[PDB]
Write a protein that binds this ligand. Structure first.
Ligand code: GDP
Lengths: 608, 221
């Protein structure tokens, strides 16, 4: 059994955190970094389960925030302290912390702790029992109003509650604190804790070759293929930090004593020449590099060329508060990674709440925060011109933002259920000359795919769904590719018209007077994979590659050229006599030409 | 306007925060460079990752004066307000701030007039970054004309020789093929006096740069 769970003390600046930690552990100046420690607990009950909680005393100061979401995991119990002295207000001021916990670790318990009971306003218990209970928040499981700097019965009850809520974690009935692990894992854990002592204090990093010599010297029976999974599990437990991804050169350096790493990386915010290149690489991996934080917080006045409503496209994004470290990740993600064409460098005006790339007066893009009156929520207005190149940029940006949300903050997409994240679209049935752009939720418009238009109560006016959401209707790609359903002759139901056995769901149909092969990509999924395959196949145009003819939305389908003689696999199995020397060479030559053009486009046709 | 203290107090009123003449009210408010309010514009340059770097493809032109004049930048900004189009139609992208404008048409047709401080120099500067293309040279000409007009029309004391003239116009050039750096600076009057030829050359005569790509307002380009 593995007795090790991560404790995390989130909180707001000026509160009691490091002193509260120093009083729970009885181990009798601001915080820089996260100050990783670990204190063991000897359970006094009959089941004396000696466990070790490794604490992560998150620093409250705002400038560090953009690094905080990186060390918030699911398998963790979060404290959150809120300085009862400034009562009835700090409880509301610690709402962003709760929302970010819920954005990062959705199903992790949280224990509110009220420091500074010494002075003064205990009616903050009222608001924390009514407001902070279940309003899209990470399931607060207890309250505690405790003093600090002085051991007391309140501190005792608090500490006992931490341990009790620790054991009763049970995500989907798992009992994380007492799960089973292979002996090799805990063995590797012990040898790492011993190697903590024998390493330069100034540079506690260790080498993969040194690790290999370590596991060879001892009785560890771990194989070379068994290393990555092992060290990864150790990483999750907060013993040593590592990044096995090959995008960085850090797959050979294994960070031991992570508190040193995090303090050193947070050092440069308030102000070993061999690894300076890797230093900057991981600095970018921490979203520090140009420094995205400390960027003057002030929108510069931007007199955009185009006004009106007809020639532009808006798309709001409503979330209660911005996530913990959202904007740095987004900016660093959109960093030249969204060109209008498939070459040219665009004009950019970075600031902490916006980017505003700019190619041409009709080919710009602007992703920037905006507040609306009588609305305590947050918004992510995306202004884009109505031209074709505009729609291309809009598609790429929505994909990148949705990618960040599904990959970083999952808690803002799962239905409870207001979803805590509502995507709008702005349209003006008043011909654009008038104003007060009506807003329509995105899911509703997605449900209005039955037609290709939207219409108000008064049916005289009508606006296409392409000029409000060119990512739903397939117009964001170049070379408009709708299939003109009048000329299609497809029958989806019968197995009589299958392309062949074991070709996915590719059917055989006639289109524009020619027999074609159509794949029914329709499923519970969204247009994500359809559009992904579409942008890949949008610009290849080579003879040795299957050429695209059209795509569709009702239902989702891909219409491509039909290979009359079937796949090469059948000819190898059925008719070996048809293949001659010249025919075999020509087949080999054509496949080689295809692979050559693909690698010329820097695309890896993984399996063949 | 009689009893001018009332006029001036009323006009300065709206800075710290008769419906018939409201149109004339706004007109004279613009005549006082109040109107959008040019003052109170956050004083903070926004980071601008310009497309073109290097030295060959751009044109700089410093303007060195000890301190910025009393009310210079508001007058300048309000003067360059859409009054310098590259062509003879299209609205350009603009990013106003208390110390710069940075119009923008295209990746090769932009312009940026903005204050810049140099280390070990208590003076002030008015760096003008402009692309080397034709439309660039057009914008540079128009901007230099408008600035010299403002100086000759508003602040005459910065042009009359005593005599360091208290206003020295530089030009930035790089005989090191642009790949290298530390753009050498040449006073404008000297280059104007170097109209005898159509080229400039350093001590080492192997390298030579045209006077058209450093000052396309002197040479008629
Ligand atoms: N009197 C009193 N002081 C407290 C209490 N809790 C914290 N403090 C003070 O708060 C300081 C600790 O702040 P700290 O948690 O380190 O701030 P942080 O590092 O930004 O999280 C100490 O100097 C304590 O004197 C309390 O309950 N009573």
């Amino acid at each position: 059994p593995y007795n090790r769970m991560k404790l995390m003390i989130v909180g707001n600046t000026g509160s009691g955190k490091t002193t509260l930690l120093q009083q729970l552990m009885k181990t009798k100046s601001a915080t820089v970094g996260i100050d990783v420690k670990d204190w063991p607990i000897q359970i006094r009950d009959k089941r004396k389960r000696d466990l070790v909680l490794n604490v992560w005393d998150f620093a409250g100061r705002e400038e560090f925030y953009s690094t905080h979401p990186h060390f918030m995991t699911q398998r963790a119990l979060y404290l959150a302290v809120y300085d009862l002295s400034k009562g009835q207000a700090e409880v509301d001021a610690m709402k962003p912390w709760l929302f970010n916990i819920k954005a990062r670790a959705s199903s992790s318990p949280v224990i509110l702790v009220g420091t500074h009971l010494d002075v003064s306003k205990a009616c903050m218990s009222k608001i924390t029992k009514e407001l902070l209970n279940k309003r899209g928040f990470p399931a607060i499981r207890d309250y505690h109003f405790v003093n600090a700097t002085e051991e007391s019965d309140a501190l005792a009850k608090l500490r006992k509650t931490i341990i009790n809520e620790s054991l009763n974690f049970k995500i989907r009935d798992q009992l994380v604190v007492g799960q089973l692990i292979p002996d090799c894992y805990v063995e590797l854990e012990k040898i790492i804790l011993s190697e903590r002592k024998n390493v330069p204090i100034e540079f506690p990093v260790i080498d993969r070759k040194r690790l290999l010599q370590l596991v060879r010297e001892n009785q560890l029976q771990l194989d070379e293929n068994e290393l990555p999974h092992a060290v990864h599990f150790l990483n999750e437990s907060g013993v040593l930090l590592h990044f096995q991804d090959p995008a960085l050169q850090l797959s050979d350096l294994y960070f031991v004593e992570p508190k040193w790493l995090c303090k050193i990386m947070a050092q440069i915010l308030t102000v070993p020449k061999n690894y300076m290149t890797q230093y900057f690489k991981l600095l970018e991996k921490f979203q520090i590099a140009l420094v995205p934080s400390s960027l003057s917080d002030h929108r510069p006045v931007i007199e955009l060329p185009h006004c009106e409503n007809s020639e532009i496209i808006i798309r709001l994004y409503e979330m209660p508060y911005f996530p913990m470290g959202f904007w740095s990740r987004l900016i660093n993600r959109l960093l030249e990674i969204s060109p209008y064409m498939l070459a040219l460098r665009p004009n950019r005006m970075y600031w902490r709440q916006g980017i505003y790339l700019n190619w041409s007066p009709e080919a710009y893009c602007l992703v920037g925060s905006e507040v609306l009156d009588n609305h305590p929520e947050s918004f992510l207005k995306i202004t884009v011109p109505s031209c074709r190149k505009g729609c291309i940029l809009l598609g790429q940006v929505v994909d990148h933002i949705d990618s960040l949300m599904e990959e970083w903050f999952p808690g803002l997409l799962e239905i409870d259920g207001e979803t805590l994240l509502k995507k709008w679209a702005l349209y003006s049935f008043n011909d654009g000359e008038e104003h007060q752009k009506i807003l329509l939720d995105d899911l509703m418009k997605k449900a209005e795919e039955g037609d290709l238009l939207v219409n108000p109560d008064q049916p005289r006016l009508t606006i296409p769904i392409s000029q409000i959401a060119p990512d739903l209707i397939l117009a964001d790609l170049p070379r408009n590719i709708m299939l003109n359903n009048d000329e299609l002759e497809f029958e989806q139901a019968p197995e009589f018209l299958l392309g062949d056995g074991s070709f996915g769901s590719v059917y055989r149909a006639a289109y524009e007077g020619e027999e074609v092969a159509v794949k029914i990509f329709n499923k519970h999924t969204s247009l994500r994979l359809l559009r992904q395959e579409l942008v890949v196949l949008c610009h290849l145009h080579h003879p040795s590659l299957i050429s695209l003819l059209a795509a569709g939305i009702r239902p989702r389908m891909l219409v491509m050229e039909l290979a009359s003689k079937g796949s090469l696999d059948r000819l190898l199995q059925q008719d070996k006599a048809s293949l001659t020397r010249t025919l075999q060479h020509r087949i080999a030559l054509h496949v080689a030409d295809g692979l050559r053009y693909l690698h010329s486009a820097m695309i890896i046709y993984r399996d063949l």
